Design an enzyme around this catalytic site. Structure first.
Site, mmCIF file in Angstrom:
data_model
loop_
_atom_site.group_PDB
_atom_site.id
_atom_site.type_symbol
_atom_site.label_atom_id
_atom_site.label_comp_id
_atom_site.label_asym_id
_atom_site.label_seq_id
_atom_site.Cartn_x
_atom_site.Cartn_y
_atom_site.Cartn_z
ATOM 1 N N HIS A 118 0.831 -1.200 0.000
ATOM 2 C CA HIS A 118 0.000 0.000 0.000
ATOM 3 C C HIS A 118 0.869 1.255 0.000
ATOM 4 O O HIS A 118 1.450 1.624 1.026
ATOM 5 C CB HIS A 118 -0.919 -0.032 1.232
ATOM 6 C CG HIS A 118 -1.884 1.110 1.310
ATOM 7 N ND1 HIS A 118 -3.247 0.922 1.384
ATOM 8 C CD2 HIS A 118 -1.686 2.450 1.356
ATOM 9 C CE1 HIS A 118 -3.847 2.096 1.471
ATOM 10 N NE2 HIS A 118 -2.924 3.039 1.458
ATOM 11 N N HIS A 142 -5.700 -0.428 6.165
ATOM 12 C CA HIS A 142 -5.670 0.187 7.496
ATOM 13 C C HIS A 142 -6.455 -0.546 8.576
ATOM 14 O O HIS A 142 -5.867 -1.162 9.458
ATOM 15 C CB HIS A 142 -6.137 1.648 7.435
ATOM 16 C CG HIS A 142 -5.247 2.526 6.612
ATOM 17 N ND1 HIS A 142 -3.878 2.564 6.783
ATOM 18 C CD2 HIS A 142 -5.524 3.391 5.608
ATOM 19 C CE1 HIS A 142 -3.353 3.413 5.919
ATOM 20 N NE2 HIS A 142 -4.331 3.928 5.194
ATOM 21 N N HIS A 171 1.572 5.426 -2.068
ATOM 22 C CA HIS A 171 1.000 6.584 -2.770
ATOM 23 C C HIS A 171 2.184 7.199 -3.513
ATOM 24 O O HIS A 171 2.611 8.319 -3.204
ATOM 25 C CB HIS A 171 0.434 7.616 -1.775
ATOM 26 C CG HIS A 171 -0.817 7.173 -1.078
ATOM 27 N ND1 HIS A 171 -2.064 7.251 -1.661
ATOM 28 C CD2 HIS A 171 -1.005 6.600 0.136
ATOM 29 C CE1 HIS A 171 -2.965 6.741 -0.840
ATOM 30 N NE2 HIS A 171 -2.349 6.337 0.257
ATOM 31 N N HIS A 207 -9.976 2.054 1.325
ATOM 32 C CA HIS A 207 -9.347 2.785 2.428
ATOM 33 C C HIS A 207 -10.410 2.930 3.511
ATOM 34 O O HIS A 207 -11.401 3.642 3.311
ATOM 35 C CB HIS A 207 -8.948 4.209 2.025
ATOM 36 C CG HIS A 207 -7.569 4.339 1.455
ATOM 37 N ND1 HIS A 207 -7.213 3.815 0.230
ATOM 38 C CD2 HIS A 207 -6.484 5.016 1.904
ATOM 39 C CE1 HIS A 207 -5.970 4.172 -0.053
ATOM 40 N NE2 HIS A 207 -5.506 4.902 0.945
ATOM 41 N N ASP A 260 2.761 2.984 3.117
ATOM 42 C CA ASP A 260 1.727 3.996 2.967
ATOM 43 C C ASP A 260 2.543 5.186 2.475
ATOM 44 O O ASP A 260 3.605 4.997 1.870
ATOM 45 C CB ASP A 260 1.007 4.349 4.270
ATOM 46 C CG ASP A 260 -0.394 4.948 4.020
ATOM 47 O OD1 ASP A 260 -0.814 5.032 2.836
ATOM 48 O OD2 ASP A 260 -1.081 5.327 4.999
HETATM 49 ZN ZN LIG Z 1 -3.277 5.105 1.656
#
Ligand SMILES: [Zn+2]
Length: 401
Positions: A58, A247, A60, A215, A301
Site C-alpha cells: 500500500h 488500514h 502513494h 481505504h 503507505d
Molecule cells: Zn493510503
C-alpha cells in the site's frame, strides 16, 4: 550452461537450512544443498538469509517526496491537522506537472528496489482536481519500471463518490486506461452513504473485472460496521478473495467482541487486509489476526509527503517499526512479522502461486547481510544483492541496470 544464475549457500527460513538456488531465465528451477552443473554468474550468500522480494502492499507513489527540498520537512512546521493536509493535496495536484509526478514515482520505485521490495500496490488520487493527470504519469512510469518492480495501480476515489460527483466518471476513465484495481474511502464518515458507496464501487469493479482495495480509516464500531458490510457485499457479488481493506484501524479500538464475531465472516469472504507500519495502532490485534489465519499484509503507505513525513521504502525497517509499535520480542512473533512483509503481502496482491523461493517460481530474490528473519529485523543491515526475473538489479546499495 545448465543455469543462468546460481546463489550458493543460501539460508532459507521456510526450509530452515542452507541450499544452492538454480535459476534459468525468470524462474527458479532447482534447490539443493549443493547443485552440480555449469552456470554463467555466481553469488555467495555466505550462509546468510536469502528471501523472496519484499511486498509493500500500500503506497502513494504519485505524491511521494513532496515534503523534500528544505532544511526541514515541508508541511510539518505546524501542528498536524486533517484540513491542512487535505488542502496541501489539492494545491499539489492542481499545480503539479506530468513530469513532476512521474519523477516522484520513479524516485519511490528506486528507493523501494534498493531495499529489496520487488512488488508494490500504489493508490493514485482521482478527483475533479487531479483528474487523470496523476493516473497517466503513474501508468507511464510503471511501464518504464517493469524491469525493476511489479506495480499494481489502484484508481483511488480520494474525495468520495458522493462528495465529488465527478469521481465516478473519472474512475471509469482511469480503469479504462488500465488501472488494476478500484477503491474508495470511508463509506461512513466521508461518503455518508455506506450502502451507496460500496454498491457503486462494486459496480465499477465488475464493469472492468478488476479487484477492490478500500481505504477504511473510520475508528471504532463504525469502522468495523463498514468492513462487515464490505465483506458481506463481497460474498453477494461473487468477489471472494478479490477485496482488500486497507488500514482497519478500527480493530484497535472497537470492542474485541466485535472482531471475534466478524472473523468468521472475514474468513468466509476471503477478506484481505493491509496494515501500514507508518500508522499501525499499538493495540492493533496483528498477531491475533495472523494466528487466526486472516490474510494481513504490510506497507509504507505515504512516503515523505503532507500525510507522512517519514519513509525509506524499506520493508525490513518497517518490520522493526512494527515490533516496537506492537511490543513484540519472541522469534515466533518476529517470524510472523517477516511473513507479513513477504508471503502475506503476496497473497494480498494475489501472486502467491508464483511467489516464494521454490522450484518453478519467479527468480525474484534478495540476498541479505543477516543470518535470519529475526536477525535481519534486529540488525537492519543493508541488502547485499537484489534479483528480479533472474537478473541482478541491485549490487551493494546501488541500482545496476
Ligand atoms: Zn493510503
Amino acid at each position: 550452461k545448465d543455469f543462468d544464475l546460481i546463489i550458493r549457500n543460501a539460508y532459507l527460513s521456510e526450509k530452515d537450512s542452507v541450499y544452492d538456488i538454480g535459476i534459468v531465465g525468470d524462474r527458479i528451477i532447482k534447490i539443493e544443498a549443493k547443485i552440480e552443473g555449469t552456470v554463467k554468474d555466481e553469488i555467495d550468500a555466505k550462509g546468510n538469509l536469502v528471501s523472496p522480494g519484499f511486498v509493500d502492499a500500500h503506497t502513494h507513489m504519485d505524491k511521494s517526496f513532496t515534503s523534500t527540498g528544505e532544511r526541514l520537512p515541508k508541511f510539518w512546521s505546524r501542528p498536524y491537522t486533517r484540513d491542512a493536509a487535505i488542502e496541501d493535496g489539492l494545491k499539489y495536484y492542481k499545480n503539479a506537472t506530468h513530469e513532476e509526478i512521474k519523477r516522484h514515482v520513479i524516485e519511490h520505485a528506486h528507493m523501494q528496489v534498493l531495499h529489496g521490495t520487488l512488488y508494490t500496490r500504489t493508490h493514485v488520487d482521482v478527483d475533479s482536481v487531479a483528474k487523470t493527470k496523476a493516473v497517466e504519469a503513474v501508468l507511464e512510469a510503471k511501464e518504464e519500471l517493469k524491469d525493476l518492480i511489479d506495480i499494481q495501480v489502484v484508481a483511488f476515489a480520494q474525495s468520495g463518490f458522493f462528495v465529488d460527483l465527478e469521481s465516478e466518471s473519472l474512475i471509469r476513465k482511469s480503469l479504462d486506461m488500465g488501472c488494476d484495481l478500484v477503491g474508495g474511502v470511508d463509506p461512513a464518515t466521508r461518503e455518508n452513504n455506506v450502502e451507496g458507496s460500496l454498491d457503486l464501487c462494486f459496480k465499477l469493479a465488475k464493469e472492468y473485472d478488476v479487484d477492490i482495495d478500500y481505504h477504511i480509516h473510520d475508528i471504532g464500531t463504525v469502522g468495523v460496521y463498514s468492513i462487515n458490510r464490505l465483506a458481506q457485499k463481497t460474498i453477494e457479488n461473487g468477489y471472494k478473495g478479490r477485496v482488500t481493506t486497507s488500514h482497519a484501524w478500527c480493530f484497535a479500538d472497537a470492542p474485541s467482541e466485535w472482531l471475534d464475531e466478524a472473523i468468521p465472516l472475514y474468513k468466509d469472504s476471503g477478506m484481505k487486509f493491509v496494515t501500514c507500519f507508518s500508522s499501525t495502532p499499538p493495540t492493533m490485534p496483528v498477531i491475533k489476526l495472523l494466528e487466526a489465519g486472516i490474510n494481513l499484509g504490510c506497507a509504507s503507505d505515504n512516503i515523505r509527503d503532507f500525510w507522512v513525513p517519514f519513509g525509506n521504502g524499506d520493508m525490513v525497517q518497517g518490520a522493526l517499526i512494527e515490533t516496537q509499535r506492537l511490543e513484540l520480542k519472541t522469534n515466533r512473533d518476529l517470524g510472523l512479522i517477516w511473513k507479513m512483509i513477504t508471503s502475506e503481502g503476496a497473497r494480498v496482491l494475489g501472486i502467491e502461486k508464483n511467489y516464494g523461493i521454490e522450484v518453478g517460481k519467479k527468480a525474484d530474490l534478495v540476498v541479505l547481510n543477516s543470518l535470519s528473519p529475526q536477525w535481519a529485523i534486529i540488525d537492519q543491515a543493508k541488502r547485499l544483492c537484489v534479483i528480479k526475473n533472474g537478473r541482478i538489479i541491485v549490487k551493494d546499495e546501488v541500482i545496476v541496470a
